[PDB]
């Protein structure tokens with residue numbers, strides 16, 4: 254039963270309870286513990302059922318979760334959250350499968366991860382939204398990663414649209430770098446593809462600050478009229494402790510409630526970074542920290558005055574060293590096309606420092622244009638959406654064919670290289686593409 258959490262929908266630049274029609278404001282906290290490299294607390298009832306009572310005391314209605322394991326069940330925890338009126342904002346990526354901001358790709362491997370999370374989590378009415386990326390671009394040196402994130406938003410949205418699932422919105426979470434902030438926010442609502450909502454990591458308010466002096470007034474004037482819901486994906490600067498959380502009074506106050514859809518405190522668990530409101534002891538029990546009462550009191554005080562439901566933008570121009578995100582986006586990764594490489598290529602490589610070494614080597618012998626992806630120029634190779642191993646295998650196979658010894662000896666020395674016997678057996682279009690490529 255999900256009665257206490259009606260699905261939230263988006264109308265204009267606001268969230269609304271789909272049953273009541275009242276504006277929904279996020280009063281949230283980040284909930285993530287640091288087998289899989291990440292820990293999925295929502296897959297383990299002994300963890301989530303310990304914490305929900307404290308989350309209830311805090312007064313939160315939303316958790317932000319950075320990584321789930323899609324191979325595990327989540328209904329116990331999601332139902333337990335619903336019973337307390339709590340929703341989940343969830344990233345689609347995980348640290349080891351996270352668009353690489355320094356070497357960006359939007360490919361079948363990352364897309365498969367995204368689909369897996371969508372198929373694991375979309376049945377829950379209290380799944381508020383998905384993040385298709387989190388601070389990928391983070392300064393003026395890696396703005397070219399943003400077209401890859403936009404492609405991911407488009408493709409996650411399309412995958413959801415074509416699925417039988419409720420049309421859970423797909424958004425983006427960004428940092429607060431002064432040089433890139435404005436351009437990023439415009440980019441994610443520009444042209445033909447838009448984020449559904451937008452979260453900003455917001456640490457401008459530290460200790461006993463004010464609306465005017467923190468920078469909140471400037472950010473609020475900045476986002477006034479923004480076409481999609483906007484909120485703080487993180488808040489809780491820890492410069493002064495115990496954190497007063499007096500920013501909460503401002504965020505849900507009259508001047509900010511008309512622009513922002515609330516925010517999520519960072520974070521629940523105390524870990525090496527010192528941002529918790531609770532600490533898990535040696536006995537796996539919850540010890541409440543000095544911050545907890547302050548957040549609780551502020552959330553309890555917060556009463557945002559909302560409206561009721563009944564009541565294309567130009568992309569930033571390109572400038573070298575300032576903004577290098579092309580409006581033109583990578584294509585939707587094509588699992589079938591890429592899977593036909595596994596079938597027809599003579600020389601294959603099992604997944605692995607070696608990528609950079611081997612691409613350097615192979616791309617000195619054959620033309621790697623077909624696997625390159627350039628977010629600055631909007632030039633994306635025909636097989637740039639395949640997995641890194643598929644891309645490497647393509648180049649190795651091209652070299653094998655160029656040598657033409659046809660002796661089943663693949664021209665790269667590595668235990669991970671093998672000749673593909675399936676290649677000898679008598680995907681038609683991909684074959685034509687690859688046969689053409691030789």
Ligand SMILES: OC[C@H]1O[C@@H](O[C@@H]2[C@@H](O)[C@H](O[C@@H]3[C@@H](O)[C@@H](O[C@@H]4[C@@H](O)[C@H](O[C@@H]5[C@@H](O)[C@H](O)O[C@H](CO)[C@H]5O)O[C@H](CO)[C@H]4O)O[C@H](CO)[C@H]3O)O[C@H](CO)[C@H]2O)[C@H](O)[C@@H](O)[C@@H]1O
Pocket residue numbers: 388427428429430431454455456457458459460461462466467468492493
């Ligand atoms: O670095 C790891 C971390 O980085 C994040 O991205 C950051 C981003 O948060 C950052 O945003 C800038 C804010 O820090 C902002 O904050 C200023 C605030 O710190 C300052 O505090 C006062 C303090 O200086 C004083 O001594 O004592 C008083 C006590 O009351 C404090 O209030 O107050 C300023 C105004 O008075 C306030 O602006 O400043 C700028 C301008 O808005 C923000 O851009 O920018 C970083 C560098 O560009 C950026 O890397 C990520 O989100 C996170 O994931 C990473 O882990």
Ligand SMILES: *[C@H]1O[C@H](CO)[C@@H](O)[C@H](O[C@@H]2O[C@H](CO)[C@@H](O)[C@H](O[C@@H]3O[C@H](CO)[C@@H](O)[C@H](O[C@@H]4O[C@H](CO)[C@@H](O)[C@H](O)[C@H]4O)[C@H]3O)[C@H]2O)[C@H]1O
Pocket residue numbers: 283285287319320344345346347348349351352353354355386387388389454487519520526528
């Ligand atoms: C906001 O600021 C606080 C404190 O200043 C900071 O600790 C937060 O950092 C997040 O904390 C979480 C743990 O509490 C982490 O899970 C989280 O990490 C990020 O999670 C996303 C979601 O799964 C992944 O996509 C990240 O993975 C990296 O992604 C980048 C961009 O795609 C890639 O370049 C990297 O290859 C990849 O590792 C991941 O680190 C963490 O961000 C702040 O959000």
